[PDB]
């Protein structure tokens, strides 16, 4: 995607949105970092930075209950 061999999407062909461009700019629409996860929660869904860090933490643990709430 860096060298023009495939269409760049933010992040996926279908599932992309231009509001993710400032977040995903540095990585050409590829989700690389823990910090990008947090910026997506801030920008896309209005999270606080601290609530965003709590989402990333919950994604590490992978618990059944826990996601269900943040998913909402």
């Amino acid at each position: 995607r860096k060298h023009g061999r495939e269409e760049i999407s933010y992040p996926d062909v279908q599932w992309q949105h231009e509001s993710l461009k400032p977040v995903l700019e540095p990585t050409y629409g590829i989700i690389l970092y823990q910090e990008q996860v947090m910026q997506i929660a801030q920008v896309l869904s209005g999270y606080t930075l601290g609530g965003a860090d709590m989402l990333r933490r919950a994604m590490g643990k992978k618990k059944p209950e826990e996601m269900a709430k943040q998913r909402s």
């Binding site: 860096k2 060298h3 023009g4 061999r5 495939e6 269409e7 760049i8 461009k21």
Partner: protein, 120 residues
């Protein structure tokens, strides 16, 4: 390929002939967006610029490139250029990418003859 000397020298001739290749080099675009500007030939109207991109490289062309290209063309023109990328593969004019190659081929042939004629 090969040699970056020859390709950049060859680019100098392209610039020396094509107003668009010259303009692109003056703007000095970085890479991906440069390749978009490079694979397209620049038609220019009274207040418009429609870059006819080789549909052969349609997958390079993205709005993220177009907007950076537009800012650059606007910096060149010194006033707001409505720069658009359009997708028409017709070969009637040469892009600065397509521009490079022909002269090189011809030069190769001539100098192959000189080498054959060195004698021994």
């Amino acid at each position: 390929e090969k040699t970056p000397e020859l390709a950049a020298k060859l680019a100098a001739e392209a610039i020396e002939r094509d107003p668009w290749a010259a303009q692109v080099s003056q703007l000095s675009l970085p890479k991906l967006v440069e390749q978009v500007a490079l694979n397209a030939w620049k038609e220019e109207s009274d207040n418009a610029v429609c870059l006819h991109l080789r549909s052969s490289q349609r997958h390079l062309n993205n709005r993220g490139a177009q907007q950076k290209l537009a800012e650059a063309l606007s910096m060149l023109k010194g006033s707001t250029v409505e720069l658009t990328i359009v997708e028409d593969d017709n070969p009637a004019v040469r892009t600065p990418l397509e521009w490079r190659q022909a002269i090189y081929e011809e030069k190769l042939a001539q100098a192959r003859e000189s080498i054959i004629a060195d004698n021994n």
